[PDB]
Amino acid sequence: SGHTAHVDEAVKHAEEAVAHGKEGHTDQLLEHAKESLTHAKAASTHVGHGIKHLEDAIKHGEEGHVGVATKHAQEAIEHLRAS
Numbered sequence: 472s473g474h475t476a477h478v479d480e481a482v483k484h485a486e487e488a489v490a491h492g493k494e495g496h497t498d499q500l501l502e503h504a505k506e507s508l509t510h511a512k513a514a515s516t517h518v519g520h521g522i523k524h525l526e527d528a529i530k531h532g533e534e535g536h537v538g539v540a541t542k543h544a545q546e547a548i549e550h551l552r553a554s
């Protein structure tokens with residue numbers, strides 16, 4: 472897709488990852504963070520910050536720290552929305 476659609480899908484999935492994370496839905500946050508990341512990579516400086524945070528969100532999620540994965544996914548949205 473073009474840049475716009477990828478950024479949009481990256482934001483939407485990151486929003487859904489955040490929403491899952493606040494509910495403690497670790498695997499669902501992971502599923503969406505990974506979809507967000509695929510789109511953010513396909514959209515590829517705002518985007519690069521978003522990618523870094525999504526990668527961090529996935530690492531922390533895989534580590535059982537869904538609060539920390541959530542915050543990183545929120546940070547990714549801020550950056551992706553910047554872009």
Ligand code: NI
Pocket residue numbers: 472473477513
């Ligand atoms: Ni594309």
